[PDB]
Design a protein around this motif. Structure first.
Motif, PDB file in Angstrom:
ATOM      1  N   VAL A  71       0.869  -1.183  -0.098  1.00 53.73           N
ATOM      2  CA  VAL A  71      -0.006   0.093   0.133  1.00 53.73           C
ATOM      3  C   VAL A  71       0.621   1.315   0.129  1.00 53.73           C
ATOM      4  O   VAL A  71       1.644   1.340   0.919  1.00 53.73           O
ATOM      5  CB  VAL A  71      -0.803   0.182   1.298  1.00 53.73           C
ATOM      6  N   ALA A  72       0.762   2.065  -1.007  1.00 52.81           N
ATOM      7  CA  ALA A  72       1.588   3.042  -1.056  1.00 52.81           C
ATOM      8  C   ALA A  72       1.208   4.300  -0.026  1.00 52.81           C
ATOM      9  O   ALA A  72       0.094   4.587   0.277  1.00 52.81           O
ATOM     10  CB  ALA A  72       1.495   3.685  -2.588  1.00 52.81           C
ATOM     11  N   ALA A  73       2.295   4.846   0.650  1.00 54.25           N
ATOM     12  CA  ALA A  73       2.256   6.088   1.318  1.00 54.25           C
ATOM     13  C   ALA A  73       2.140   7.228   0.325  1.00 54.25           C
ATOM     14  O   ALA A  73       3.296   7.704  -0.411  1.00 54.25           O
ATOM     15  CB  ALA A  73       3.340   6.139   2.207  1.00 54.25           C
ATOM     16  N   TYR A  74       0.995   7.717   0.108  1.00 57.28           N
ATOM     17  CA  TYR A  74       0.642   8.463  -0.818  1.00 57.28           C
ATOM     18  C   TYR A  74      -0.355   9.635  -0.621  1.00 57.28           C
ATOM     19  O   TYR A  74      -1.552   9.158  -0.324  1.00 57.28           O
ATOM     20  CB  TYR A  74       0.209   7.754  -1.861  1.00 57.28           C
ATOM     21  N   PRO A  75      -0.225  10.868  -0.692  1.00 59.44           N
ATOM     22  CA  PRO A  75      -1.318  11.888  -0.489  1.00 59.44           C
ATOM     23  C   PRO A  75      -2.216  12.378  -1.609  1.00 59.44           C
ATOM     24  O   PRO A  75      -1.624  12.294  -2.679  1.00 59.44           O
ATOM     25  CB  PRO A  75      -0.488  13.190  -0.077  1.00 59.44           C
ATOM     26  N   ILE A  76      -3.528  12.442  -1.423  1.00 61.18           N
ATOM     27  CA  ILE A  76      -4.467  12.697  -2.356  1.00 61.18           C
ATOM     28  C   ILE A  76      -4.977  14.308  -1.953  1.00 61.18           C
ATOM     29  O   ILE A  76      -5.795  14.352  -1.104  1.00 61.18           O
ATOM     30  CB  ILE A  76      -5.467  11.774  -2.676  1.00 61.18           C
ATOM     31  N   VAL A  77      -4.426  15.265  -2.606  1.00 62.40           N
ATOM     32  CA  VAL A  77      -4.874  16.692  -1.915  1.00 62.40           C
ATOM     33  C   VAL A  77      -5.647  17.276  -3.130  1.00 62.40           C
ATOM     34  O   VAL A  77      -5.204  17.150  -4.396  1.00 62.40           O
ATOM     35  CB  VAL A  77      -3.530  17.520  -1.821  1.00 62.40           C
ATOM     36  N   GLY A  78      -6.493  17.978  -2.825  1.00 66.41           N
ATOM     37  CA  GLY A  78      -7.550  18.589  -3.586  1.00 66.41           C
ATOM     38  C   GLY A  78      -8.063  19.959  -3.089  1.00 66.41           C
ATOM     39  O   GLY A  78      -8.016  20.003  -1.707  1.00 66.41           O
ATOM     40  N   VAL A  79      -8.405  20.762  -3.802  1.00 67.03           N
ATOM     41  CA  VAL A  79      -9.089  22.095  -3.552  1.00 67.03           C
ATOM     42  C   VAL A  79     -10.367  22.259  -3.874  1.00 67.03           C
ATOM     43  O   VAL A  79     -10.820  21.559  -4.769  1.00 67.03           O
ATOM     44  CB  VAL A  79      -8.337  23.099  -4.273  1.00 67.03           C
ATOM     45  N   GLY A  80     -11.108  22.970  -2.887  1.00 69.36           N
ATOM     46  CA  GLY A  80     -12.475  23.220  -3.267  1.00 69.36           C
ATOM     47  C   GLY A  80     -12.926  24.643  -2.891  1.00 69.36           C
ATOM     48  O   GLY A  80     -12.417  25.341  -1.935  1.00 69.36           O
ATOM     49  N   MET A  81     -13.624  25.393  -3.663  1.00 66.59           N
ATOM     50  CA  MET A  81     -13.798  26.572  -3.620  1.00 66.59           C
ATOM     51  C   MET A  81     -15.379  26.913  -2.873  1.00 66.59           C
ATOM     52  O   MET A  81     -16.252  26.130  -2.718  1.00 66.59           O
ATOM     53  CB  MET A  81     -14.155  27.355  -4.978  1.00 66.59           C
ATOM     54  N   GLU A  82     -15.119  27.838  -1.819  1.00 59.73           N
ATOM     55  CA  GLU A  82     -16.200  28.017  -0.764  1.00 59.73           C
ATOM     56  C   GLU A  82     -17.072  29.417  -1.325  1.00 59.73           C
ATOM     57  O   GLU A  82     -18.289  29.480  -1.057  1.00 59.73           O
ATOM     58  CB  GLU A  82     -15.708  28.110   0.799  1.00 59.73           C
TER      59      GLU A  82
END
Lengths: 51, 52
Positions: free
Chosen positions: A33-44
């Protein structure tokens, strides 16, 4: 035959041993299992300034 | 006929221009504090400025 099975910056021993960063979730301790970030942005909200 | 007219006036104008995109500049007077166990060197905070 691979020092990094999952392809991430940590070797199989570092992952299995837990010798890496301590903020990495415990599922990413096994070498498949990869140590791996899944980063996303969201507008408010969006604000307009007329020129 | 012959006429000679002599005039003199004076005026006063006041103006006011306004930018609707940058109508003012804000200046925040702030202060940092440390409530932990270790010192911090080269303190660089990031701050939001919120109206509503």
């Amino acid at each position: 035959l691979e020092s990094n099975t999952a392809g991430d910056p940590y070797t199989d021993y570092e992952k299995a041993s837990g010798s890496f960063d301590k903020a990495i979730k415990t599922e990413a301790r096994d070498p498949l299992v990869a140590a791996y970030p899944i980063v996303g942005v969201g507008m408010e909200k969006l604000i307009i300034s007329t020129n | 006929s012959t006429a000679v007219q002599d005039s003199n006036g004076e005026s006063w104008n006041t103006g006011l221009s306004i930018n609707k995109g940058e109508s003012a500049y804000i200046n925040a007077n702030v202060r940092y504090y440390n409530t932990g166990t270790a010192p911090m060197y080269k303190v660089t905070p990031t701050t939001n400025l919120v109206l509503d």
